[PDB]
PDB file of all heavy atoms in Angstrom:
ATOM      1  N   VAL B  49       3.783  -2.764 -22.449  1.00  0.00           N
ATOM      2  CA  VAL B  49       3.993  -2.113 -23.748  1.00  0.00           C
ATOM      3  C   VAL B  49       4.272  -3.129 -24.878  1.00  0.00           C
ATOM      4  O   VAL B  49       3.676  -2.989 -25.970  1.00  0.00           O
ATOM      5  CB  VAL B  49       5.075  -1.003 -23.696  1.00  0.00           C
ATOM      6  CG1 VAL B  49       5.355  -0.443 -25.106  1.00  0.00           C
ATOM      7  CG2 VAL B  49       4.585   0.116 -22.745  1.00  0.00           C
ATOM      8  N   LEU B  50       5.125  -4.115 -24.588  1.00  0.00           N
ATOM      9  CA  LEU B  50       5.403  -5.227 -25.542  1.00  0.00           C
ATOM     10  C   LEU B  50       4.111  -5.954 -25.917  1.00  0.00           C
ATOM     11  O   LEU B  50       3.896  -6.252 -27.090  1.00  0.00           O
ATOM     12  CB  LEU B  50       6.403  -6.258 -24.966  1.00  0.00           C
ATOM     13  CG  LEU B  50       7.858  -5.817 -24.943  1.00  0.00           C
ATOM     14  CD1 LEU B  50       8.729  -6.821 -24.175  1.00  0.00           C
ATOM     15  CD2 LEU B  50       8.361  -5.608 -26.368  1.00  0.00           C
ATOM     16  N   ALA B  51       3.290  -6.245 -24.911  1.00  0.00           N
ATOM     17  CA  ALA B  51       1.968  -6.833 -25.150  1.00  0.00           C
ATOM     18  C   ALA B  51       1.085  -5.989 -26.081  1.00  0.00           C
ATOM     19  O   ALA B  51       0.431  -6.559 -26.946  1.00  0.00           O
ATOM     20  CB  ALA B  51       1.298  -7.144 -23.817  1.00  0.00           C
ATOM     21  N   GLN B  52       1.083  -4.695 -25.892  1.00  0.00           N
ATOM     22  CA  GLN B  52       0.343  -3.758 -26.775  1.00  0.00           C
ATOM     23  C   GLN B  52       0.821  -3.755 -28.239  1.00  0.00           C
ATOM     24  O   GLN B  52       0.007  -3.819 -29.156  1.00  0.00           O
ATOM     25  CB  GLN B  52       0.429  -2.303 -26.269  1.00  0.00           C
ATOM     26  CG  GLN B  52      -0.499  -2.001 -25.117  1.00  0.00           C
ATOM     27  CD  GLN B  52      -0.713  -0.498 -24.943  1.00  0.00           C
ATOM     28  OE1 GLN B  52      -1.752  -0.002 -25.317  1.00  0.00           O
ATOM     29  NE2 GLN B  52       0.298   0.177 -24.455  1.00  0.00           N
ATOM     30  N   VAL B  53       2.133  -3.690 -28.434  1.00  0.00           N
ATOM     31  CA  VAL B  53       2.733  -3.731 -29.734  1.00  0.00           C
ATOM     32  C   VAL B  53       2.599  -5.124 -30.363  1.00  0.00           C
ATOM     33  O   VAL B  53       2.784  -5.323 -31.570  1.00  0.00           O
ATOM     34  CB  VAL B  53       4.165  -3.255 -29.745  1.00  0.00           C
ATOM     35  CG1 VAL B  53       4.334  -1.879 -29.100  1.00  0.00           C
ATOM     36  CG2 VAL B  53       5.088  -4.223 -29.057  1.00  0.00           C
ATOM     37  N   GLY B  54       2.302  -6.119 -29.516  1.00  0.00           N
ATOM     38  CA  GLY B  54       1.985  -7.442 -30.008  1.00  0.00           C
ATOM     39  C   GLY B  54       3.142  -8.391 -30.091  1.00  0.00           C
ATOM     40  O   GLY B  54       3.110  -9.384 -30.877  1.00  0.00           O
ATOM     41  N   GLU B  55       4.237  -8.142 -29.367  1.00  0.00           N
ATOM     42  CA  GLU B  55       5.384  -9.038 -29.332  1.00  0.00           C
ATOM     43  C   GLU B  55       5.145 -10.177 -28.372  1.00  0.00           C
ATOM     44  O   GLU B  55       4.501  -9.988 -27.351  1.00  0.00           O
ATOM     45  CB  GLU B  55       6.665  -8.270 -28.970  1.00  0.00           C
ATOM     46  CG  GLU B  55       7.024  -7.116 -29.932  1.00  0.00           C
ATOM     47  CD  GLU B  55       7.566  -7.614 -31.266  1.00  0.00           C
ATOM     48  OE1 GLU B  55       7.669  -8.824 -31.514  1.00  0.00           O
ATOM     49  OE2 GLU B  55       7.938  -6.731 -32.113  1.00  0.00           O
ATOM     50  N   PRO B  56       5.668 -11.368 -28.696  1.00  0.00           N
ATOM     51  CA  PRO B  56       5.529 -12.497 -27.762  1.00  0.00           C
ATOM     52  C   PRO B  56       6.430 -12.213 -26.540  1.00  0.00           C
ATOM     53  O   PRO B  56       7.569 -11.869 -26.717  1.00  0.00           O
ATOM     54  CB  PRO B  56       6.003 -13.682 -28.571  1.00  0.00           C
ATOM     55  CG  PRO B  56       6.799 -13.094 -29.705  1.00  0.00           C
ATOM     56  CD  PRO B  56       6.361 -11.707 -29.920  1.00  0.00           C
ATOM     57  N   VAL B  57       5.876 -12.329 -25.368  1.00  0.00           N
ATOM     58  CA  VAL B  57       6.581 -11.878 -24.169  1.00  0.00           C
ATOM     59  C   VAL B  57       6.213 -12.777 -23.000  1.00  0.00           C
ATOM     60  O   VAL B  57       5.077 -13.194 -22.885  1.00  0.00           O
ATOM     61  CB  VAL B  57       6.319 -10.367 -23.836  1.00  0.00           C
ATOM     62  CG1 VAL B  57       4.833 -10.151 -23.547  1.00  0.00           C
ATOM     63  CG2 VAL B  57       7.213  -9.842 -22.698  1.00  0.00           C
TER      64      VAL B  57
END
Side-chain angles (χ1 to χ4, degrees):
Chain B
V49 175
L50 285 172
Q52 282 199 104
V53 307
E55 300 287 0
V57 62

